[PDB]
């Protein structure tokens, strides 16, 4: 926000990405490939 230009935040924060990654990891560890 200096000379007419702005940067917009992303829709998904880092916590949501971490939650998605954790869910994928737990699913593949426990259920094999069936959950897909």
């Amino acid at each position: 926000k200096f000379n007419g230009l702005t940067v917009l935040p992303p829709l998904l924060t880092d916590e949501m990405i971490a939650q998605y990654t954790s869910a994928l990891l737990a699913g593949t560890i426990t259920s094999g490939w069936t959950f897909g």
Binding site: L24, T28, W33, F35, G36
Partner: protein, 49 residues
């Protein structure tokens, strides 16, 4: 003053257009990479390849 402002205006407009075109090219390349990443996620994490 109109002449001077015209010169400044055309220069800055050209610079802006150059920036936008470069951004478009880079975005297309990043989209291709993201599609490849999504395919790898689908095929190698959710199953054996």
């Amino acid at each position: 003053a109109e002449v001077q402002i015209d010169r400044l205006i055309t220069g800055r407009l050209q610079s802006l257009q150059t920036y936008v075109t470069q951004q478009l090219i880079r975005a297309a390349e990043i989209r291709a990479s993201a599609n490849l990443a999504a395919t790898k996620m689908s095929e190698c994490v959710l199953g054996q390849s």
